[PDB]
Design a binder for these strands. Structure first.
Lengths: 322, 322, 322, 322
DNA sequence: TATAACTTCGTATAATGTATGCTATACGAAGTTAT
DNA sequence: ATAACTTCGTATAGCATACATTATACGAAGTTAT
DNA sequence: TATAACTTCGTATAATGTATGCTATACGAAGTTAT
DNA sequence: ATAACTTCGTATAGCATACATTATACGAAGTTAT
């Protein structure tokens, strides 16, 4: 069909309208689905519902997460819907089976994990140790953890901070201007303020890195063996390395990860977000203020991190013994 | 017509998409609709809005509640939508009778109900009346009333408990790990501390019952007319029974049921939930604390349980009393 | 057209799906539009945009409120849309002229008025006088004002209160169950609690009226010359009479209305709502609690009663002199 | 084609549907689009999405802001929608470039701006520098800066003020009745108290100006090079002039403009609004109090003015400082 | 040189929220009028 | 010529109204147990 | 009877918010099993 | 026969997930100034 080619061509022409990660996962899903189709001699593009049902069942049978299976469907759905074709999910075979796969897995324990929390106590411990070190690695890392926990920004937001994004209060606290986040793309964007402590941590790093040469440098950059910063205004510190700082800081305190292969045996990119969310809840911060903290315009995900603070809470118990 | 045959096979094949309670209600509604149709010379499938409209008006004439009339309409919508067919509710005729029937029925003052509060006033009365009775079922029921008040846990939830789900903490207080979640984006297991007095009751029951003798054994079990427990791990105590414990306990104090045929004359499955929440807000406890105690996230409902408390009477009452 | 007749016939068949006031104003607008069409020899049913534009301009030219003109359009729009025909507002002639008429009127002062406030001070004054009277008129009226100001219910909500809708707290305060309001039609509905003062006022009235004979009596009923109540379970006190109580209570204190013909020279049905809203704001009640008070699920109308509390507010002024 | 001729006549005829500022921007955009089309051999009307897409990409290449690119697109959407024609934005091509252009531009860090804060630090500086200067324009400007700080009133709003809109209260404080509303569901006239020091300045100005000599005379008026005021009541001082007072006042202290061509180097119309709000939140004032001071109901905006204040730094900063 | 400390990348899995269309201001710059 | 505007055009920040009902507001006429 | 105190009604004008579709419990009642 | 269930059906209250992305998680391979 002429129209389908056109629609696809249009989406590719302005591919920059979508996150690069959407593209990353579009192609990845397409590769997996392409492969399954080839293994079973099946037309892979206009995808047949029943074929899609077999494929979701096969993903299930490989032991894949409910959420990852929803991903494979999601991209297939997007590829079809933006083509002008009907979505696989538009048929019952796919709809019902997706709902069924979720029900079976969930009803056998499957649960979406969350990042191991990096909370205030963790931050103070990390800091009590590393604040002394005059190494470049250590000063940078300590400053990044500070920002992460102070501001609750995602790591991709942190790696985009430019030195000119930083301003100041009369009070002396650093403010970091963010524009783009996951949930938001604006020109006015948001301001996130650091405490006086974290501001110092960040001053130390600026000072010692020489990022402030060009004010269009990324606040965070790489640091080599010899301890020399490598500022850039065109290459940011990969988010993979910020994941690494979290894994190294965890390793520093708790030693090496298990042999098991499980996710979340050590801190990761999101660890400071669930942790600072959680600390606020427990100090009585109001639910709106928590949402303002993490950029959350809606209430449900925040309830869904105090999710697992829901431990022994024991209101009724006290009531009972008196 | 061939399409809808496919769509109905899609449904039987992926029947595990829905819980067996949904299928139950689906089947029940179809039975009611098909009867009505036969008795009124109407084709039952596909349904035509004129016939669906008369049917909903028959359901109103019959005294059925509005939530009930919605359910019949819902499953009819469901059944037709899961085939290639138009839903009744997408017709102007059925859409207007639902509106007409809703408001009509509220004007004659049909009232949504809820569980009769089983409170602390009531758990002392009961304890008082059978604290030190040595009957093996009097011991079981007393324990279970404990767990239901303390943990505001649903009834199917208490059915599932086992002895392997019971650790300890300060004083003795038992650690009931749970499946309070049957959802993906939701806690990976929750936890409930019993009081010391209630931990004591779920001790004395474990003695007599002898449920410990297997980990995989369910906590609550059947107890026959000879006061002997009958542990199992393939067979959990039904919800209807746990219901029964509550009604029996009501009969104990207040005697035989009021005989209107009405609902919520005795206590039922939820009475302890309702009661505990009310007790909890009476002594002042953060509403979102209450919300976490029985795993609510949709305050519409908990609100309805504590409405007639004096602590909830609102701002105007507060102002007026100067 | 056959379809248009059918659609209209369907709406009339289940007319009870719409408020009777919608019907009242449908016919009233139709009468006015019918009349204008007859005066200008114009087809009145499928209404021509340009004819509708002339008619809105004529309503403007009679000096009618912007909001009343929006009403005439509203019903014309509804009559057409529910017929299956295009709305007048679907054309530019009508759209643009409506927007223009609003702009001209507003840009010459026109503003939507609000009810004269009946606030706490007013209620205490009214009460300081009438609380003594043992007349039936006075006891009833005083109790209605109490409820109005205490609960913020609209008068139609107040006239629907049945004696069985009333319950109690442990604390001794009356609760009044509402089901239907303007913005809401439910079976669970809402509970509104009276203070201890208003509860007394209401006790006096119940006591002295004999409404509590049949518990399906309307809490408020008429009272004749001789001071004898006339309870009914099938005829409520007209909302026009509740408007009258407000006008009489105003007259009692401030004397007779002007000669001017202006609306809101004396208290009316909504006077206690804007007044209690306003009092809450000024005592620092939180904006959510205000919304809970008046049944308001959204924030804008409440801002739009503290609307005209916005008087001399003078935060900046204090700042300036120090 | 005849339809769109009707639709364009509908528009000229009801041209008062929109403000003359909307028409201005509409006309401006058409001029830009038509030029671009001629210069690029494209039909200007109806617009085809391919051509609109290239045009928006030309607007991005030209350095225009995203709010600006939206405006061009908006008026194009408007113009076409008010004819029987499809909007550009309803095409997949233009929809994706707008997305692409938005995020693209935020990544090179284009930043939404706002008025440079004219604060109390700045109104003392100014007063200091010209408190007791006897120049008739130095007297006018000083007064007006007063009114703008004190009342956070927009500039067109201050233009409209007259002497007949000025009563009194405690000490002298002037009573500026206003048209802060140009909306129906909105206050029926508002009110602003000036301070005593500022009331003094709007006294000394009325002396010299001689504006009192007619009620209907506008408060602020033109003052020629011979230090003589020129009252009018048919002619209000333009907004561009009131702007000018602010820039002049900036030049006074800081000298000639920074010469980047940039925006918000001096103060402008809104500077006093911005400044006053910031000052108001600095000394702690309920946010919704601030919101009422300049008639906001959409806190998105006021938030943006007080972001870098230390009192607004958020919960995390508060927790971290123990 | 070997090596820290990356980047790049693939597949795997969590998170996150359900909008614009009109109207005001900003400002350089050209037009107007009386000093 | 120039101060001190006003008018303008193009660039951006700042805001409010439409839609589909459902309700109250009030003067005026008909009703009914005193 | 005249009259308070309505009801009914018409036209006029303000107010008010942008949802369900699945899954659990309630309970009388019939079925089952061991005392 | 009966207590004490379980299973059932029909009646209602109580709840949670789908959708379209955009992001992080982490092991493993290629890179590069020391």
């Amino acid at each position: 069909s002429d129209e389908v080619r056109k629609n696809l061509m249009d989406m590719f022409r302005d591919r920059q309208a979508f996150s690069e990660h959407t593209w990353k996962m579009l192609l990845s899903v397409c590769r997996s689905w392409a492969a399954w189709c080839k293994l079973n001699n099946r037309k892979w593009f206009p995808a047949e519902p029943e074929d899609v049902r077999d494929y979701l069942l096969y993903l299930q049978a490989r032991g894949l997460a409910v959420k990852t299976i929803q991903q494979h469907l999601g991209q297939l759905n997007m590829l079809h819907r933006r083509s002008g074709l009907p979505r696989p999910s538009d048929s019952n075979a796919v709809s019902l089976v997706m709902r069924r796969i979720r029900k079976e897995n969930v009803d056998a324990g499957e649960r979406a994990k969350q990042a191991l929390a990096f909370e205030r106590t963790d931050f103070d411990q990390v800091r009590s140790l590393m604040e002394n070190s005059d190494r470049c690695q250590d000063i940078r890392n300590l400053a990044f953890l500070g920002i992460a926990y102070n501001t609750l920004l995602r790591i991709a937001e942190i790696a985009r901070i430019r030195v000119k994004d930083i301003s100041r209060t009369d009070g002396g606290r650093m403010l970091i201007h963010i524009g783009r986040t996951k949930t938001l793309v604006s020109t006015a964007g948001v301001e996130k303020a650091l405490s006086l402590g974290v501001t110092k941590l960040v001053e130390r790093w600026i000072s010692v890195s020489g990022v402030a040469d060009d004010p269009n440098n990324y606040l965070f950059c790489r640091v080599r063996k010899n301890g020399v910063a490598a500022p850039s205004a065109t290459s940011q510190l990969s988010t993979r390395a910020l994941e690494g700082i979290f894994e190294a800081t965890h390793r520093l305190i708790y030693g090496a990860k298990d042999d098991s292969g499980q996710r979340y045996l050590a801190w990761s990119g999101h660890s400071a977000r669930v942790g600072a969310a959680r600390d606020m809840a427990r100090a009585g911060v109001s639910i709106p203020e928590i949402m303002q903290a993490g950029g959350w315009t809606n209430v449900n995900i925040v309830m869904n991190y105090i999710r697992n603070l829901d431990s022994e809470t024991g209101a009724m118990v006290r009531l009972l013994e008196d």
